[PDB]
Design a protein around this nucleic acid. Structure first.
Ligand SMILES: Nc1ccn([C@H]2C[C@H](O)[C@@H](COP(=O)(O)OP(=O)(O)OP(=O)(O)O)O2)c(=O)n1
Ligand SMILES: [Mg+2]
Ligand SMILES: [Mg+2]
Length: 516
DNA sequence: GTCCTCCCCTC
DNA sequence: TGGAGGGGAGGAC
């Protein structure tokens, strides 16, 4: 009993086979996979260049992605192209594709940009908008590969996915009769006791698993195991599952590399939040694995603060630093040691801060009715044990077309509508591509126009768009756009308004119809 | 009841 | 940065 048995139960293991519940198991095996230098790799592949070519993706005068080759010269995202040229004589800057105002398609103008001397080879900010479609297209191809490999994939941003490897790990653990640990030892023989129990079917779901067999310690992790204290690699079933998951994840990443050409970095752990930190730890082309017994070593390595966690990077994180009196460094360890035993300790502390007459609820981002959830979230995050589910997203949720405007390039309603015509062409084209690619009817329901005046004042309007089929979709979007921009022009009467500094159209709500 | 506006989160 | 995109609160309707 107890230290004579695993820390984990049959329930926790069997849960890995449930897509709805696998994430809440302490045995969960989550991967976060992030494309290295994504937009720069897309341009590299498009132009038939190699990983040794110092490519940068350029948007107007800013570098928005830097190849690992260019990084060797000290080039950083948001360098200007001129600053980058001073660091690397052999630099290959490639401008994003663009739409020209007055046209209804996008294209690349290779050999063109602000760095080019020839005045015939400029891509003027007055006259063009960006197309990110080449990057979106490649993102969707990658998504298709991830979903072919794994039954639960969350697209987290244009170049990131989370994978729940629970079913793959479980199935391998229990059923894989071919996997070799050594030249003399198969996985099936190493795990003969647990497989016998499982097939025998005689276990109690609430009973602890047996201690791991010595023979499973021959199982190898694939990738970089984060382990500065030199802890034993395989000591319980979580380590077994994680090691199996590292083997599978390398195979998935190799499929991405072989089919599309892209290198990835990857984080492997029992939770999404730790995976995301681990994927960014080592780049390019690496997989960082964070064992449960190494979570505190990792979180406390000095790279991370509580604000490093998803949702805590902005004003709520800053409020929590003030409310919880967190230090400027080693805040994660501080949270852990100050409320060491349970989340109720932290909840009690929060409730007192919040119940004070002088706490301003109208400006706070803390919900005083939800302090139990906040306390548990902070308690578990500080220990690397906050498990969030993965969501499989619809084909699309929202779609935006945006132009930040310089000079007088939008100086009247005539100019606004000219830009709306580009937005409507772009959005309709994106919708048609999704319909073809996923065999759906994709129907915009709501549109929002947002703009900024010369004084940077925001004006916005949203409402319904009618549907008449794909062949009338651009027209239906433009009808609403024109309506909204003229309405806002009236609202701006006698106020600082033209020339605008920004105009955007967003389809904020879609209906998606499946076809047989 | 849902819709519109404004705001906060991320890459 | 610009140009995305995800998500939710709460008063308007
Ligand atoms: N503020 C940002 C951040 C990123 N991107 C784009 C360019 C990136 O290539 C892509 C993915 O973002 P990442 O943060 O993953 O950065 P990279 O993939 O470029 O580099 P890394 O190898 O560090 O992941 O999104 C952008 O347009 N604006
Ligand atoms: Mg990336
Ligand atoms: Mg990213």
């Amino acid at each position: 009993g107890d230290p004579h048995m695993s820390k984990f139960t049959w329930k926790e293991l069997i849960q890995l086979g449930s897509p709805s519940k696998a994430y809440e198991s302490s045995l969960a095996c989550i991967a976060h996979i992030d494309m290295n230098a994504f937009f720069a790799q897309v341009e590299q592949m498009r132009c038939g260049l190699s990983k040794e070519d110092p490519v940068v993706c350029v948007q107007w005068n800013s570098i928005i992605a830097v190849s690992y080759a260019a990084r060797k010269y000290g080039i950083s995202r948001m360098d200007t192209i001129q600053e980058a040229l001073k660091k690397c004589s052999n630099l290959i800057p490639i401008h994003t594709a663009v739409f020209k105002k007055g046209e209804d398609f996008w294209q690349y103008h290779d050999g063109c940009g602000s760095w080019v001397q020839d005045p015939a080879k400029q891509i003027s900010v007055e006259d063009h908008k960006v197309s990110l479609e080449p990057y979106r297209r490649e993102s969707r191809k990658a998504l298709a590969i991830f979903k072919w490999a794994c039954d639960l994939v969350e697209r987290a941003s244009i170049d990131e996915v989370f994978l729940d490897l629970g079913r793959i790990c479980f199935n391998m653990l229990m059923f894989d009769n071919e996997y070799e640990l050594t030249g003399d030892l198969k996985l099936k023989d190493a795990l003969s006791n647990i497989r016998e129990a499982f097939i025998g079917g005689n276990y109690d779901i609430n009973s602890h698993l047996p201690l791991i067999p010595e023979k499973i310690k021959s199982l190898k992790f694939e990738g970089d195991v984060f382990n500065p204290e030199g802890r034993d690699l395989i000591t319980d079933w979580d380590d077994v599952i994680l090691a199996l998951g590292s083997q599978v994840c390398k195979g998935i990443r190799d499929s991405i590399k072989d089919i599309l050409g892209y290198t990835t970095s990857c984080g492997l752990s029992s939770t999404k939040n730790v995976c995301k930190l681990a994927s960014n730890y080592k780049k390019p082309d690496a997989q960082t694995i964070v064992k449960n017994d190494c979570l505190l070593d990792f979180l406390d390595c000095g790279k991370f603060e509580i604000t490093s966690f998803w949702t805590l990077g902005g004003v709520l994180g800053k409020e929590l630093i003030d409310v919880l009196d967190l230090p400027h460094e080693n805040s994660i360890k501080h949270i852990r040691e100050t409320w060491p035993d349970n989340a109720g300790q932290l909840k009690e502390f929060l409730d007192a801060k919040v119940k004070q007459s002088d706490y301003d609820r109208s400006t706070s981002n803390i919900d005083p009715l939800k302090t139990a959830d906040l306390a548990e979230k902070l308690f578990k995050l500080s220990r690397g044990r906050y498990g969030l589910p993965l969501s499989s997203r619809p084909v699309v949720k929202s779609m935006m077309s945006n132009k930040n405007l310089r000079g007088k390039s939008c100086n009247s309603i005539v100019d606004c509508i000219s830009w709306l015509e580009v937005f409507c062409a772009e959005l309709t084209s994106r919708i048609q591509d999704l319909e073809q690619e996923y065999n759906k009817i994709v129907i915009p329901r709501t549109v929002s126009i947002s703009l900024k005046t010369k004084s940077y004042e925001v004006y916005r309007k949203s409402g319904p768009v009618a549907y008449k089929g794909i062949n009338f979709q651009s027209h239906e979007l433009l009808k609403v756009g024109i309506k909204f921009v003229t309405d806002l022009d009236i609202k701006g009467k006698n106020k600082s308004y033209y020339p605008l500094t920004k105009l955007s159209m967003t389809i904020t709500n879609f209906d998606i119809i499946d076809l047989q």
